[PDB]
Input
Amino acid sequence: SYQVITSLLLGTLIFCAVLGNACVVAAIALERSLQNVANYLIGSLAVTDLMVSVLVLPMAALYQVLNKWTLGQVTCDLFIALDVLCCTSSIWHLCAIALDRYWAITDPIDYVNKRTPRRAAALISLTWLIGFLISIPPMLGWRPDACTISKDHGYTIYSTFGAFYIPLLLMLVLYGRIFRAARFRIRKRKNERNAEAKRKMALARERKTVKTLGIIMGTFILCWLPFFIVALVLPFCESSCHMPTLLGAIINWLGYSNSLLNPVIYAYFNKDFQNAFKKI
Amino acid sequence: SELDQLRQEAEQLKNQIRDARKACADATLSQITNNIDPVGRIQMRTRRTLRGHLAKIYAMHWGTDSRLLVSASQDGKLIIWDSYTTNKVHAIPLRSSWVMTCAYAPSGNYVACGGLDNICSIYNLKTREGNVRVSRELAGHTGYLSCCRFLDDNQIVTSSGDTTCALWDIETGQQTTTFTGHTGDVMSLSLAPDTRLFVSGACDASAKLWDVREGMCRQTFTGHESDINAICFFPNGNAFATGSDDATCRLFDLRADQELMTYSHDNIICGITSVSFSKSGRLLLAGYDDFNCNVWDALKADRAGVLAGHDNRVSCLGVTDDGMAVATGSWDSFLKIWN
Amino acid sequence: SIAQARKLVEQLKMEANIDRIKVSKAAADLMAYCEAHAKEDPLLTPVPASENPFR
Amino acid sequence: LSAEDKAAVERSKMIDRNLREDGEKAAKEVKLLLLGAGESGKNTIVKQMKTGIVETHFTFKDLYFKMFDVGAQRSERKKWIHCFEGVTAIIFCVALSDYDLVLMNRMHASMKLFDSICNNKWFTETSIILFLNKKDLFEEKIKRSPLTICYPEYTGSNTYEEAAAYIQCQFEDLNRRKDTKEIYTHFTCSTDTKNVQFVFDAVTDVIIKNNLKECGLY
Amino acid sequence: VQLVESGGGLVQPGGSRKLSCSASGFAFSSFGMHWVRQAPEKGLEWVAYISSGSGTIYYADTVKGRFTISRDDPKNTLFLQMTSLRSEDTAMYYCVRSIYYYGSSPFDFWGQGTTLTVSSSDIVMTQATSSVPVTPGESVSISCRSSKSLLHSNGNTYLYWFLQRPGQSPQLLIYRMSNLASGVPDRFSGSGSGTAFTLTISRLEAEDVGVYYCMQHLEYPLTFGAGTKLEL
Ligand SMILES: CC(C)CCC[C@@H](C)[C@H]1CC[C@H]2[C@@H]3CC=C4C[C@@H](O)CC[C@]4(C)[C@H]3CC[C@]12C
Ligand SMILES: CC(C)CCC[C@@H](C)[C@H]1CC[C@H]2[C@@H]3CC=C4C[C@@H](O)CC[C@]4(C)[C@H]3CC[C@]12C
Ligand SMILES: Cc1cnc(CNCC2(F)CCN(C(=O)c3ccc(F)c(Cl)c3)CC2)nc1
Output
């Protein structure tokens, strides 16, 4: 029946997410040429998405297959809090990676003189602190065979804005300024042929920046924005907005697919990570 | 035009030396060592990994106690390791970080280092103060210091990129003897066990035998096609092995005045950075640019083993005097003791 | 020049007047040194973990 | 572990710490490999920035530069050029007033040295800051001596601007692998007083573009 | 190389003093420093140890908590903060430099010492023999007994020999048993195995007259023998 089909699809999604994130963490821990601040942030994002894929995705998949929360309400609140913490921390690792790249590209003097793995650790701690500050209040009090996220309107605003919309604006701004910096650096007989080759290479670089920023921002947005639009509008829809179960579940699992795709976007597309995998 | 007549005499002498070598070439070393039992496949495993160098390691040298080893890295540090406990005994800040050779005194009281600064710096390991300090700076080479080896606490022989080797009186700091005759950069040195004579390989693809006391090149060995980066005596001092950039190691006999084997595999194209002999001399361990050390049956030219485990070029390697271990240094900033 | 060519000729002459043993004798000597010390070579014959100081 | 073994381990850990801070301090230094023909004007370049090899250290806009001069190394360069493999940039000094001079032509020797260094297997991604020195003496000599001496196929005006641009193009076309590296050509004679600013601009550009390449934006 | 101790003097019992060690002539920060006290008529007694970098500190069980050892590496100074001085603290306190790496020579240099006249499982080194009569030019052996095997599983035997010449600070002769210290003539030899050790003097002189102390360096209560005096 469809129980086995959805169980298999969710199980292979979880398995490949765990495999990807654990492989990125392994490539960080094993390869010597991958211990640096940028890859510390990337591998911490992989760790956060591994915690998602292990401590969260099995529970979400069990709840989706059984169509009910056969476990307790206390463990429902526990796993929802763990969900919110881990996914908020994953989105904010995306933000921390964006911030690190922005500082690397716009502040090379800082990149050389002041950029140390302690800043990577500070950024990771900030992401997890934001995840805690978003995930804990529903347990502290901002609040039938079902397991949902606290639909309190004040908490809806607080959790959706602090976990996606503030991150969305932050990374849109940071990657827009990164795009401007990248375009600045790119644009900035035999002579004619050489100038033509230079123009062709500059246009290829501009297309490369567009492709890279499109991949980053598009995977982030197309994965999490549907979830946070529904998570913002449904608590404020008394009865007008009914969420179809199929559409609601696909929208729910798009962000989980973001946890799947983050290692692909930030590690498996990387030259050094891919080389380290070819060397293992 | 007396240059032509002198050149003709030199060419005639080269032909005479070639004929003398060929006359003694009655049977290659492979023919004699067909009946000897081939040690099939030695499996040396990394016992220690010496970590703490932050740049490419260019040289290491073992202590005569077979436990302490000095290593030279481009991070400007000369680190002395206790290889048994992995402990760092000393970390010596180098005045010039462009070190590419390091020697350890046979007494253990000194280390030497040098490189692009053209100075062989002698470091007193055993001072009344607790610090290692530069006891001597041996200036006089006009090229980079490529190798240095202590004869004793006061004699050291250094090779250089000025195509010469020099014997130094460390107390006076002066070149006691200069060993000229190489036409290319001299890259490696190896003292004979009795230290009365030494071999040096250079970039002219030739290895020369130098009498330390006489200051003369007793023999010249020309079998390599590219720069000789590594040289090592056989344990008995009657032969030596070279490592060049043509992916070949060669064994030259002193008495036969001729090359005896070539240690080359068709699957190897990278140059050799370092060669060394096991205690009995049957194994020739050579470090390569393909990131790993190949262990060769010195008597049968058989690739008896591979010491893979370095992520960059194996720049240096030495076997302990007791023969218990081989330490390979590499450009990936790691020293590995194998056994 | 005169000096360099003369020095090279003298060096070649001095390296030519060398008593060279047969490579048969040289190879036999190296092989004999190899059996005579094969038992003293820990790398050739791996020592047990009790006698190996790297373990 | 005995008491002395424990204290030796503690000493090794202190050594490890000191190595860590030394490496952290050394990582904040921009390494520059200074090349040229010795008479190319790299000496006045060094003076503006301020045997064996010479290390010149200077700080500019909070970047600390370590510039290594290897002109006194008259030995074969393949044996030691890999020592500077991780250098941030190469500062290549060429005297413009060398086209009509001879050691072969000096500027031809400079061109072949530049070609070998630029397309060296160890510098496939290392950008080159190309200093064209003696621009004023180049003016005074291009007024009288034509540039066609060095470049017979020049077929151009013997004015300073056209001749200097031709020399810059001749040096920059020796740059194969133009995707992985850039040449930052600067015209100075002996009093530009903007050479350190030019090197800072080129190095910050190199760092920024390396960071962009890390992120897939270059 | 010199270590100069500061502090000490007449102290009412229950008082507090700070002993200071002005170290000069050597890389003080790289040496683990010790305090070794000696009662006015008895043998050496190790008091406190501060390692290089201050990361490891030990005290004798008779001073632990009661004493504090500290070093000023920038000022090249070693401190012993003493509180509640019992009459049992009446001793000349020696600062001892000791460096620990493979093949090092710990306890190699000793300070001059300052007397402190307070007003009114440990391995046991045993030197039963004491005050031997000797004649110059004639060999002598000094025995040493240990309550535990000083030979560690790493192969080292951690027995030290010191010479307290009359009116002078102790001077390391043999550091790890059968290891002659630098500056010591090659007539002193160290021997033994496990718990029994001997220090043999090949041909003694009038400069060899003094008290010879054992020490274990196996654990960190550092215990000395009741030194065997030599007298013409
Ligand atoms: C759940 C999965 C399917 C989400 C995957 C989203 C991916 C496949 C989509 C979403 C946004 C898309 C990007 C949008 C913008 C651009 C820039 C363009 O110049 C190249 C294509 C590129 C780079 C697209 C690549 C594919 C892309 C990243
Ligand atoms: C490779 C990845 C990134 C592609 C995207 C995978 C996601 C978006 C897709 C693939 C399989 C899909 C699931 C397939 C099965 C079901 C059961 C259905 O009753 C509710 C929707 C639900 C739960 C889907 C949710 C969305 C889903 C998980
Ligand atoms: C601020 C913020 C808010 N929301 C998110 C992501 N939330 C995704 C879901 F809505 C997807 C759908 N759910 C589940 O199927 C589910 C059910 C039971 C469970 F035990 C678990 Cl673990 C999951 C709930 C959780 N991140 C940050």
Notes: The longest strand of chain E covers residues 16-24.
